[PDB]
Amino acid sequence: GPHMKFTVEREHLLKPLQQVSGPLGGRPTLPILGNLLLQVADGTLSLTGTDLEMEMVARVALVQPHEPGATTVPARKFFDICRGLPEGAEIAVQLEGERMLVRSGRSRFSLSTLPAADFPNLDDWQSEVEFTLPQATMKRLIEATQFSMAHQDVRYYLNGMLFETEGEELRTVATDGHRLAVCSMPIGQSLPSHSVIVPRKGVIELMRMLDGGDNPLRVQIGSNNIRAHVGDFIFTSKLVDGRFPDYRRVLPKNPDKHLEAGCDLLKQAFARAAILSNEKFRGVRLYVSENQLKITANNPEQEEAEEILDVTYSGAEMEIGFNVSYVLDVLNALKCENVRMMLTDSVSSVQIEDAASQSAAYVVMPMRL
Amino acid sequence: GPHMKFTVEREHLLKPLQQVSGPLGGRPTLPILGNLLLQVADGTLSLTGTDLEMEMVARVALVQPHEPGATTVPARKFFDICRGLPEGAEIAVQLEGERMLVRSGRSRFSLSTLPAADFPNLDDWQSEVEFTLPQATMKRLIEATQFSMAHQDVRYYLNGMLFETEGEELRTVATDGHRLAVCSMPIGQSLPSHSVIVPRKGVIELMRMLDGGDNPLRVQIGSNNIRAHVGDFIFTSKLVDGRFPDYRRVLPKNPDKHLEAGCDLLKQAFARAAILSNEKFRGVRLYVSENQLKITANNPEQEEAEEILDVTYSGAEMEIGFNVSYVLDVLNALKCENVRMMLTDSVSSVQIEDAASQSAAYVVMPMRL
Amino acid sequence: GPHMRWYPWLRPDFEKLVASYQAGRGHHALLIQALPGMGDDALIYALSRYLLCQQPQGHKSCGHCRGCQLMQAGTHPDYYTLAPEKGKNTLGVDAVREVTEKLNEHARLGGAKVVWVTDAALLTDAAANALLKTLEEPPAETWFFLATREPERLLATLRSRCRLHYLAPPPEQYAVTWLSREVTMSQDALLAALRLSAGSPGAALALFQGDNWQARETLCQALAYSVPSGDWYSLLAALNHEQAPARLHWLATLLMDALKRHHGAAQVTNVDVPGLVAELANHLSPSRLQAILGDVCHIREQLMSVTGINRELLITDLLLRIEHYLQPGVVLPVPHL
Amino acid sequence: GPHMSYQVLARKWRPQTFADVVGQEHVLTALANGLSLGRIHHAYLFSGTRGVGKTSIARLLAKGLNCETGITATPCGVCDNCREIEQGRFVDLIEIDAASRTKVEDTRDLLDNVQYAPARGRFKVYLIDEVHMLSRHSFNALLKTLEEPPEHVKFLLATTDPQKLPVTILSRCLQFHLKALDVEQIRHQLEHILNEEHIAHEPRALQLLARAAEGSLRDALSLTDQAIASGDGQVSTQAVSAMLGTLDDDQALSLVEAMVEANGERVMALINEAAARGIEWEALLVEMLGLLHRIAMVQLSPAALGNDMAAIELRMRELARTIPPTDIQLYYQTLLIGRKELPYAPDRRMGVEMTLLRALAFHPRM
Amino acid sequence: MIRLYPEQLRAQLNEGLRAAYLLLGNDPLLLQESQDAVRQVAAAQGFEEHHTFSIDPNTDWNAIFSLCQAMSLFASRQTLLLLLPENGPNAAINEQLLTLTGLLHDDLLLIVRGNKLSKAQENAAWFTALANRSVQVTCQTPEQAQLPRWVAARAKQLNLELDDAANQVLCYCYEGNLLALAQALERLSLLWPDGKLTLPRVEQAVNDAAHFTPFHWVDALLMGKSKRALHILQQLRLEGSEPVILLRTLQRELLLLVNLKRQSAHTPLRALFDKHRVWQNRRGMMGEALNRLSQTQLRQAVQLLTRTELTLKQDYGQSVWAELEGLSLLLCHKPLADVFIDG
DNA sequence: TTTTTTTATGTACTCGTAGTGTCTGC
DNA sequence: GCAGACACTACGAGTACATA
Ligand SMILES: Nc1ncnc2c1ncn2[C@@H]1O[C@H](COP(=O)(O)OP(=O)(O)O)[C@@H](O)[C@H]1O
Ligand code: BEF
């Protein structure tokens, strides 16, 4: 309880406070869940922030006299105090009664705290999978499968992202009910096969905490919990209970007709044809023949976009209707240069893939011609 | 004869038209109110928009030979008819009965009009005083005292600024009975003494009208309204009938106690103390002792904040309690290096000014609990 | 449509009132006690025309200055009107508050300011109270004009802060001559209409111009049918309308004249219809006639005063109570102290 | 704080097992049979009079659903989560004061917490108190969640005014309506707590407390605590009677009782007591006129007595049966005339007293 | 268009799903039951993905049209649901529904839930375009007479024995609130699984949570049922309905009764009812009233009504609720004292 | 089988929009 | 910067309730 003390520099404290602020500050379910949990142990400081389903913990090294105590201090007030101090000034912290005292050069504050016994904590869970990954791979997986994620759908399972551990391969899957995105990469180690759903907040905080430096992001997955270690930042969350649909079915498993093109050219053509589509029934029609493809859109103006001779094709005549937003998003998120597009049928799913690699795959459902 | 030959280019009027429109016809108060007057004079086209309180006129240069006159048209229709024309457009407006025909190539449109006699407008009047103000001068003058306006207070005369011109000096005074701000600047022009009370809305609209030191501002103040000419734009707002209080009798007469400090240090200290101040009663108690300023605050939760500043103080030890918002506003307005504070009694008002320049003054009236 | 139809009987007063403003010593607040439609609106309009004119002459507006043009167009930054909102017969406190807040700023055209309320009797208590102080001490060069059916009906506090001008109605012979010039109908009906309009020629002329004369004839026929038989319920067919108070007042005047005829008064309000008043006088005893008259006028006052009251229920109950009063052996109401 | 007696009887005597709730058999038996026989609904909405047990019974349902010894009506109370629900907080029991969280920005987060698996118990239990104060958009969000509820969550909404809820929420909730507790049940319970709290009591005081409870057991407990306060740790008949007389607000009905009884001294004493409380006199006359009109309607037909006047049903019935209609009409006329003449009196107190004296002059006693 | 009642839906659903289903009624329970049956049958026939929308000037219509025109990766069969506003389909909403019918497809099943359709509403062409192949379900609340038969039929369906007394109690306590009636049926079935329900068992777990309308009060007054009229009046007061609605609803009929009683001295009621468009049930009730009411009772009723109106409108008093019991006890068979009618 | 409601002013509440302060990787 | 992003604050609208 009492006697706990800090003596920390602002530079070593400001960034972890920003990391642990997260969603705190707004009106919480319980009055305690607006206070960062401050702990001292073995000469290190632990900052904890909780959302009844999240927990972000930041560790700060201590090289000053202190005492292993604990407390809970309001997040916004403490962060504002630590931010308003002059640059390079050291913060000296102690506790007395229910008042936590902060001190700097000719400056003293008293803050109202709450006992650590009442602070909720995520229950201990036995891990099923241990995992190590560079930041770049995780960022690539998340960025290429976050745009195609469901938004406030009545179906809970479509919310969030699916993690697959298969052999020596980690896979991220997203689906909104019409689009599907799969991004699968090797990891250098073999893992038991596992299917785990991560909520939207979980993937958001996974993406935010990623750093541009070299760091072995240490992921730990249990039956109904996920945890990630990035340096001194430990972020844990619950798992979305449900049954994510099998991604291996809707994808064009056995396609026949396919197109090869440049990503930039298709992006420009799709953007040009976007202005040819009315806001209602906002879609496009791709009419494809041998090495030919035109893109039109239903509109009272009755316009057309016509660049047939800029595509490769080895099949027969087809006419398939897409939604301009979905194809624009997938093309923009693909970011490669050569794009392959498999056209299984006029009434079946259509695959968009990197023509020069196999790291990503996307499935788009045509909308009634 | 129905001459009304308007020959203008579109891109040279879209910004003026949007400017004079502003609060264009959206109020069903009067059908004539939701209209804009087109007039031809001095080889230029005057676009006039008025809602019986504020008048705005744009003087756009003509292109081709014209035909003098005046007629009023629906403002929104004219705004929408020239905002979508591709790039430039040869707007040719002609009168037919009670109609304006707007032509530009193969683009002919009609706007039903009203005679200019019905439109309320202000003719020439004998100006009580005339100012030739540099834009920076008036910008600083209004900026340093705009925060001191009374926002809809019972005393109607306080709902604006007092422009007092005396000798070759122009002063602005703004107060609400708790804070007061006076800013005086030279003009180098022998001007008769006069007092003006410009309402809140008028000064706000004037402030968001002037920019760029390249176009000197011309101010004409009469007995019932004030007009400002910035470049080719003219603004007109009525005056307040009240009488502003004598500010020279509001400033303390014998400020025996002197204080000087750094502006940045005071601002940082006051913000730091206001972090933990009361939410709706943001007031700090300040003790002055020999070369020491102790600022303290608290909240209903009793989270006291205390800070000490090394100041140059001349006087006896003293206590005074004043709100933080007014003093933070004054310190922000005084973009200076040294702040000088004048204190008389623990029950008297405090003066704040720039220590290195005698061009601005502020009065903060303390809190008596 | 209806506009400043100047009337001859306003000539002696208007020339007087402008004089009070010509010397500059006039009261800022002038409450006109004039019967409805008699010409108070036209007089107030002409006075405002004189007041807002920048270059006036004698006793009329120039018609050339921009103030005159804007006033004629119906838009003016220094000419505020306080009228009941469309479809509602009351003047809200919000309009009065907006006008009062606008009065703080100077007059735009450099002249004076005019605030004209169409009918002060329609002021809500909150609105009249919001107008109290504005009436008391207005800013420099501010003029208020109020019109009322009865000044004593106004708030006892508002009426105190106002110079009260009474527009005397013309003598009955002058009024009947004026309406004979205006309307080519019988003298008896014209005199009856003038007496119905309390001597106000404008109200009688408006009654003849509208369908109210046909309604009065129908009501007289219905009364002729119902007096001997007591079938007063049929009167509902003629009484229920958006102008029910006027027809109730017509019935009250008929009962007035029946009581007068029983007492033998020389002149009667309804001179055009002697048969109906004679039938009412002979068929109905004065004791029950007084009760019927009192109940009819009470119903009229209730219908006028409380807004949102249902005309159907009140008129039907009045007719049923009248029929009950006709039957012998029924106690009659007595006025309450 | 200091000394165990600080525990408020409205809090310490919170029921912990279904055998402790009293007077609500028609809901307790239904809940027990549903839990035992496996029948279950997506959501359960509680309603009824204040202080009847809606929140207590909802907490008992939360205890029963989340005991590892099987979904059962009677929880053990020994294991971890049974105690955690009552003592401390239980993770899987989410208690939301809807009055504090009316805005949709909180119900949105709440329904973002429904897709997560429960931690300890099998059923994620939501207890939303005062559900009739949620905003319309929050109601839309709650309906969207209730349309397809996952099998691991079951809602519990407790409210006092069921009429304010959307009909589409009532349609998917099996509402349990709790009747106001009878006088006998309240008296027996109060005797039980008083005997088990080592507090002396007297049966007439208990009957007075039960009658003054107006049917809400919380009112009875609060008045019991005040009665213990008014005195030295003893529920005496005199102290209870004095406290109720101080707090009594039925001046109009007792006053018309005394007036029809032609007891002038009683009427004057009642007027004195009403004056001591600062009772509005015009409101007193209006209430008396209402009572006379209602008793006349009762004389015309016994059906005039609805559930709105159940507290004073017996007194009004007996005063209707014993009094001829003519006296009722005469008293109504006198009181109406007196209310008409009340504003033009030296003061309201003497005016209303003068009206009562006028009424008492008709058919007086020897 | 096959127009049906919820009793006959099952067989129709077994005959084969129809392109559109229009669930229209003023009864939440029957509408919800029909919707649940339709969705269950559709799920049996492959319709797995369900989408729900609320019709509103704030409705993102473009999303609805796209969903109706977009195929899903899983469970291509789709069910569209709409909730009509209390005003029904407006003219703009009528055009929106016409456009929706234009995009109607075989693989898409459409369900509409809302209040009754007024003649103008189905006059709009989209209704006929749907009716070319669709089914409409009238979920209208049974009247007072039809309630016991429906309650007994549901009780036999739910396999529980109800006598006449328990049925009468349930009808008297839950009228116009069939949702609460089924809640009570479930409560009684679960309380005593014996399946036998009598007066002592049902008198415990039943409350008077009835839902009434001013027309019920007026018809109760017309039929002379004073106890029923008082029950309806108390229930409406507890609900919170504006008393001026009751005043107007009674005033229209009372004025008609006064006029017809005045005219009955020359013409029989049979022609008088046909003069002013009186319906058959209304004709019977009005004839009974006019035969059981005299002129004096009607005059006193009008006098009390206008006294209550004056009290409500100019005095802003709160005695109208108690005073309406005066009319309730005066109209049926019981003349009231003079002081309570005038003063 | 279609039928019914008084106003004037004010006080909260909850939501989208709308305009602006500020400040962080962009 | 910076502008976007995000934060935050204000206004309107639509609804609900109270009062006389
Ligand atoms: N049926 C009951 N049995 C026992 N105690 C009760 C009962 N009803 C109310 N109480 C008492 O009142 C206190 C608060 O009860 P609660 O159930 O919260 O009332 P509410 O219906 O207003 O939410 C409880 O702690 C309990 O002491
Ligand atoms: F008192 Be209860 F919880 F509404």
Ligand SMILES: [Zn+2]
């Ligand atoms: Zn003029």
Ligand SMILES: [Zn+2]
């Ligand atoms: Zn247990």
